[model samples]
Target: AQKLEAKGGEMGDVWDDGVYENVRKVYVGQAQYGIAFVKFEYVNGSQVVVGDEHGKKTELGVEEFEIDADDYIVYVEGYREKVNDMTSEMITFLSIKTFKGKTSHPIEKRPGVKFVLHGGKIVGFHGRSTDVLHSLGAYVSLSSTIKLLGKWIKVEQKGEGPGLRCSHGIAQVGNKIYSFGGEFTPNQPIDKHLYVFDLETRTWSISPATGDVPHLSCLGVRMVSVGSTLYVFGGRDASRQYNGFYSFDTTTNEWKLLTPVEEGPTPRSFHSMAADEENVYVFGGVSATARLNTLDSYNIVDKKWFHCSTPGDSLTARGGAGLEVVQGKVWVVYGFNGCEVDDVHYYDPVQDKWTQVETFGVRPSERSVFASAAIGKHIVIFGGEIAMDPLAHVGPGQLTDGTFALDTETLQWERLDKFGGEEETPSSRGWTASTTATIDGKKGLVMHGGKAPTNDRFDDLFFYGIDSAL
Candidate 1:
């Protein structure tokens, strides 16, 4: 029987046969990236579909693993997803007490599939309640964990592609990474062509984009992908900046400018943007003459821009901060306004109000030019430049090599363990680029190219997560 116990938040033994009474079914399958259904044959896989409390279907798409026909698969609902680089296997978290239950299936019967999780030192799975199915042919991820080491890992730059560039835009479409527009030297754009990085193949290729292609490469571009379409907007060129909005369809490899029926936000760079199921929101950015604190919305249906009230005792004009949608609120975090800031605020779209978040946690010191992305309820923040002192940002910046996370729900901070060797970590820099990426069935953040304190740009690419290529 599998053991079903643990110490509050500390790690303990992974689940064992003692916990078998809790599991109702089992499955096994090869995962395909982006496929929603967990495949299983007759007996065990025939009767049920796994999801929410009452088993409502979930759209998480096999967190770290992909789908393939009849490959053995297991699940631990509460477990974080992972992939073992050395073995090219998927990893999952497990704890019967916390996650509820975990049962097992025989392995030797399946000679075709390789195993990854519910098999840690450390092998295990943890999961929620489910209906009893026939035999074990399951892939509803659940298992257990003993001691999960510092959960953060960073992979060094690999693959062949673009030279050092910064101030670019990146977005993940399915299993491929689409990158376009950014600076190579100072404010000059490196390549006008769109670069596509394939996660499964560990390689890069130029995306053949046709239609309304942008010329005069510049800096401060931002992109957000919805479905298979990438919405591109605001940035500066060699001479001036832009408020132009465009879209690139990954399916057709076509680009089309969404010419506004009305005026939009002013031309700028270093701005913040975020999108949800329906609307794309643009926040503060910087123009040559002044910093911006404007709030604008793009209606995906109408394909038009609307100036919305930034309603609140809003923040001052600033740029280069972090903006993301979490828990249904648009959060605006740390940035620069002549100096670094450490404040947090969120906007309630339905209520049409803005309220500063009174945060209580071990916060990072005041700094700007950082990169951040939202994961669940936590905002993962990394590398930025801080001046030697708050009063002055002179000379070279004291670049940050640390990674931290802020929980928007509890408003607490978690200083994650730093990854990469002294030489492996990218140089302390600012104005780099970042976005969420999934590779080899693994989900994590893909960070690439940035400007260093020495005014040098980077060509490196790194993936950060609990389970990443090491």
Candidate 2:
């Protein structure tokens, strides 16, 4: 037979060129040195030696020994003995490094983070005038948080500079966020000069108005994204309530005025608007003469408006209600119902009907001019007013630190008790607007400027975790 080259045998033979062992049982046994032992039983009864190149080997007395299942040989460790019947020792392991230089993971990354309650939680940004005691900027929240793992970062510019003043609008199309038309101060409106924020690059750009800027009406201006276009509708201009409608093509960065459709809802402000698939629904706002309780729909595809009256007890003609689309239905909750009310109503477009839900449990106290957003399966509400003495300078009110959650599936309310420990929480104030955006592959919410009971507006920004723990 041809001479077969030795492959592996005793450690020495394996180290050098040697013949391979016919039958080698690589078994491991415990050793005092914490090193694994290998017992090789060769097919031939010839005296075998196994060791390093130095030919060193351990001699076992004639006794019965069994190999352990946990014992294994590794290239780096050579061989390791299994510590059978031994209790594991508690050892402190080093913590993993986080990308943002934090020891622990961010709290806003969890799925439950999306179920935030508003009230006193400072989940948005506030922009106020430097001189005024009351907030002069709009109250709004972005779609998400701005932290490292947050979904979106919200930016607010109050006073008379650029973007919307005293009012708030949010539009998320692709990677850009566009805002327009607010008041420089309360009761004062500004021309529409759009401000664009690049969500990816964290930069701001301008989209000047092509024609006359839209009116600066309180709760009058609303921006909604359907497909690739953002539509702005009915707000108050300097003079009268505006019925003008404008659309901004995200792809082209161009704005076009939708020719005013005949006989739509009359010029109104403080009404609530929400989007369902391809249509925009506008409900209850104050016209020049009276408060509106009617509901109107705008078809983005047809570029037309149609009025639809909902059944059941309709909401009172008032403004400042929070409008959002949840589960293919439109929800109008907690608005000034001619008188401030805690009533919550839901409208189903498919069924063409309305249903009023109970509002007895820890509801946002009666207040107008607040903000809300739909995060996950819950509608998050924050910052509003409560009844107080009429003659008070700050207005009859109490700033709330309470946060509540409404489940769209069950149509129930829940107050968040997990917040308020050593960490920070959002403050209570009204007119603050909020929206949801994806940040860093996680779910988050951002809040922006609004007026306080003290008449002070704030530029302070805050983020809320919708999924992760704080």
Candidate 3:
């Protein structure tokens, strides 16, 4: 067992001075800008550790807040009250940030990677390299300012890889950011490798993995993290669909297969997955035969898969529907169903039920196969294709750069402003994958590689931070 020690302490030498004890409580704050926050509690502990926007750790003394019945410290800050109310075995601290204000910048004109947030800084990954003028590598910008003391600084840059590619699966355990399996080569499915970036060191390492990496030329895959393991579900693998499940364990630094029960989801791609307290919920994917509206879940504790009953009014079987879990309920939003339907649905696992919320305001022109993520209280959506006629090849698919935020409480939509200056916005593309993580102590989103209207693949990465815009 690893023992906690104060700075400049010797190992195995018990401090019998009666002043030091082991830490019994610790919780990881959300990841922003590749940085994550970790809070710990020890016997007679008086300080908290803060990882700055740059992924540097600093110890800050507690403000001598009141003590609870369990002898946990309670401090008040803004609208949130930080209380050490969790037992040693329970995870008390959770990453939750609310989007306040929207950006005022204009949208991007061309097809490019969307934005992502890490370590409290907004970052832009590989841009549209084919367009050399906009070929910016990975870039980072600060997201916060001291109320009384304003300071803005650009922290770190991890540079670029080959031609800019779209990001697929992005997960941050600590200061290390893991981006895996996305199309990089034009019109080719070359998503067989993984990239790891250390925010603390500003270093990038391409880690190779074996087994089945998706080869879907222009489809998106879903990646969800549970405990210390990353579960990657169905996505386009070559011309055929896939239903295989793979787990990547960071602790073991290895990948393994997760066999679903005999009766599980069919081979398909472009689906969505969400995790509750115990189960991982997967919904909607496109098979050769049809678009599926099936709701299936995997028991992480029992390693079993079962079909979940969704509401009859649930969105029809369709690919590209946005799905996420908010406040313990599952939210399923717009996607292509024959034609794009402005349908929004919510599912509650506890009640084993689903309900359709009202239509999102000013729908995205009845499109399918867009990307969505839950950041704080709003569900952020970006880029998709709207065909003039679902059955006609006469019109080219209209790609979009419009971004919308769906409020969980009010069931309304608000357009998000662009990032950076006036001319900064992500490219209008579809089949892209997006997920949310905390960087530096703030809430942010990461959008990665996806397909372009030209049937070409993108390798761009972008980060959007809510702190500054809010």
Best by lDDT: 1
Candidate rank order under lDDT: 1, 3, 2
lDDT of 1: 0.56
Q: What is the lDDT of residue 295 in candidate 2?
A: 82
Q: Please write out the lDDT profile of model 3 over residues 1-470, one tens digit for every residue.
A: 11111211121121111212222233333332111233333343464322112112324321211123232211100101112331111111122111221221222222211221211221112211110111112222222222112111223446443234442556666566676555554324455555676666766677656554433333355678777677877655446545467777776667777864224667666666777658887888677678788888889889888777855534688777778887688888877666554477888777877887764332333456566678666777777665423332222354566566677877645555423334335777775666665556655665666667665666565555556444
**Candidate no. 3 TM-score:** 0.59
- Cα lDDT tens digits, model 2, 66-176, are 212222111000111113333211110111111112221121111110111122111111111111111111111221222222122343333333432345666666666
Better-scoring candidate (lDDT), 1 or 3? 1
The sequence of per-residue lDDT tens digits that candidate 1 reaches over residues 367-428 is 57676777677777777765432233223345665556677777755445332223344456
Shift of residue 10 alpha carbon in model 2, Å: 94
TM-score of 1: 0.63
Per-candidate TM equals 0.63, 0.61, 0.59
Q: Tell me model 2's lDDT, rounded to 2 decimals.
A: 0.50
